[PDB]
Design a protein around this ligand. Structure first.
Ligand SMILES: Nc1nc2cc[nH]c2c(=O)[nH]1
Length: 267
């Protein structure tokens, strides 16, 4: 066995409800952030520069309403889905650097088959493969159910890259993005609430694209005041500017490490 297995969080699309979903998201958030290091009341993700391999990844066990199981590997430093496991085969996205590649080799070391995609796992690449943009890809418990099915069957011959990519895009938003933004969590919650399945509107997309920007601004903000007005998008697509972190507090839940903690008065 591998010395100390990474924490595993489970979820199932079977009898999934708003409650179970909320629990899942809160659990993920709790495993990502150590609780400590919060800038302007918002918790920050662990700094990779000094983060040991053992406390680098979080496993997410996704099960279908038809005995299908798949396990995603979440990068604790940015809630980035690095890869997944199905049956006895592990698939990882092409790393952007040797450092991460070195870390990736520690995932699912007990599988018989390991494969590394030539393409990256970032939205821009995935959308090209899926032949569909996020704004045209539906989200919800249903789509998620189908997503798990595709991912699992990839290791058996189903393959179909367009579908495979689409599945990833779905899982990422419903898990990673949901844990990142309390707002996105709500969107998914409403969808599950009414057994709905719909594509994400502008406001959601913009947030996903601006996660890094926001994290930076909030950390380099003079006591909450942003150094420059950040433009965001509304549900109808209309743009608006944000000047203070206060407005974003109930929206964003987690931020990626950017600036080094100043006098850390952690009390
Ligand atoms: N792999 C991957 N993970 C995440 C997590 C948030 N956004 C993304 C993304 O675009 N790709």
């Amino acid at each position: 066995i591998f010395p100390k297995q990474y924490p595993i969080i489970n979820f199932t699309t079977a009898g999934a409800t708003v409650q179970s979903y909320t629990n899942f998201i809160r659990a993920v958030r709790g495993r990502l952030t150590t609780g400590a290091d919060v800038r302007h009341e918002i918790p920050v993700l662990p700094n990779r520069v000094g983060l040991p391999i053992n406390q680098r990844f979080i496993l997410v066990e996704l099960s279908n309403h038809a005995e299908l199981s798949v396990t995603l590997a979440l990068d604790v430093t940015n809630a980035y889905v690095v890869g997944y496991r199905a049956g006895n085969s592990a698939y990882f996205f092409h790393p952007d650097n040797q450092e991460d590649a070195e870390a990736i080799t520690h995932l699912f070391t007990d599988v018989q088959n390991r494969y590394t995609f030539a393409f990256g796992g970032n939205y821009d690449r995935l959308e090209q493969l899926a032949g569909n943009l996020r704004e045209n890809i539906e989200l919800g418990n249903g789509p998620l159910e189908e997503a798990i099915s595709a991912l699992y069957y990839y290791s058996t011959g189903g393959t179909q890259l367009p579908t495979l990519a689409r599945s990833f895009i779905i899982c990422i938003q419903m898990i990673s993005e949901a844990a990142r933004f309390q707002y996105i969590e709500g969107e998914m919650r409403t969808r599950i609430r009414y057994n709905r399945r719909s594509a994400p509107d502008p406001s959601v997309i913009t947030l996903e694209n601006s996660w890094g920007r926001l994290s930076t601004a909030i950390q380099e903000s003079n006591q909450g005041a942003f150094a420059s007005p950040i433009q965001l998008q509304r549900r109808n697509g209309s743009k608006f500017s944000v000047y203070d972190v206060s407005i974003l507090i109930p929206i964003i839940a987690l931020m990626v490490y950017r600036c080094a903690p100043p006098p850390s008065s952690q009390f």
